[PDB]
Amino acid sequence: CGVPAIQP
Amino acid sequence: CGVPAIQP
Amino acid sequence: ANTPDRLQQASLPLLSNTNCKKYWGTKIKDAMICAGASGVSSCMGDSGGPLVCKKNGAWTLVGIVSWGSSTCSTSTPGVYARVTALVNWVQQTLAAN
Amino acid sequence: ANTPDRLQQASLPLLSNTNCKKYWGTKIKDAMICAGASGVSSCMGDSGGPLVCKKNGAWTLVGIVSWGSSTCSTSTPGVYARVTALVNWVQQTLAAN
Amino acid sequence: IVNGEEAVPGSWPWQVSLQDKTGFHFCGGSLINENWVVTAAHCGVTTSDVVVAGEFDQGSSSEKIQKLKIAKVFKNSKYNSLTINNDITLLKLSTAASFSQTVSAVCLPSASDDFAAGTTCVTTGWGLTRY
């Protein structure tokens, strides 16, 4: 968790 | 001004 | 949610700027007028609306909702723009456009 | 108007309850965490939203926008619900429902 | 308003609600003429914004509301965005309102007037009823 596919 | 038709 | 669909109204006493300073000290400047601290408070969303008092059988604009309690505490006075202080600017504007 | 149609973001440092108190005194409780005062601030409408910090390459929820400055001052820290102090309750709720 | 009361519909006729383009309520305002509204300078009003007059229930399936376009915004040049002092703006209506039992203007005081400490005033709006 907390792993966007689209990285901030 | 200041005198509503409808009274608060 | 805490947002009303119908217009709210609340009656409240005006405060003297030195009683207000009690609560907010130094953030209270020239053009500010406080009211409340008496069981009501304006809250987020109220901004820009009126504070009115009756004079000569008519309602008059004495305040513009400006800022207050970080929690809308009904025991802290709200801070309104004082019209008195800004109406010459308003009249000149109107006179001119 | 001053509302963003577009999701906005901002980086800010966490503060020690110690330091936060220099600003809010006794209003700061155990289940609260302060961040900001650095030139950014949460504001009206950001309430209930996340405060996240990276741990082990992952974004983890440390705060929930709770209250702050009546004016969203960029020099005053925002106050957040401290998830750490309230997580046992989330997990237990989750376990039972 | 926290701990207010529901208002008699149409009894605070200068009361307006400003809406942004996405469509909803961000601030209050007061009609002082048929062509001008006063509101706070902190509201950040722009000509994209619309002034809604004649509203009671922001839910009203449909009412005899009047939505007004804003021709020019007049922000007091002394407005302090850190102190919030001189919090006022004037909005000049692209198109004038049509006064009626429900829409009409409030009176303006004189710079010299004195509202004594303790005086019973009234404030209205659609803001939060609870924090």
Next chain:
Amino acid sequence: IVNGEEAVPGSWPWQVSLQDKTGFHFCGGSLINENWVVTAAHCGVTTSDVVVAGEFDQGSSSEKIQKLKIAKVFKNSKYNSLTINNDITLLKLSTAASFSQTVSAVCLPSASDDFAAGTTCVTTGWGLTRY
């Protein structure tokens, strides 16, 4: 957020916006599962609000998102409405969310986790950009 910047859409996929029955943004929220969202208690959420997920732009004539109904709201019973202490609410969805490259969850810390003063954190939301 004041003095913030636009995010890359999709990049904070747990971020939600709660809308009231009229139709718009009153509060923010965070998905922790495809069935639960965490929010503040002070937001007064009810079975009537709606949770919107996958949203980036609030002015789209129509965008590709997901409006979720709330089955039950769970307020922390320790929530102090005068003190604002224990400001948190759990929202149990009636229709679980559909995770994807733009909707997914944040990680929850442990009660014994330590986040030291000085750590650079991030906050996101649709609040005002200026008071």
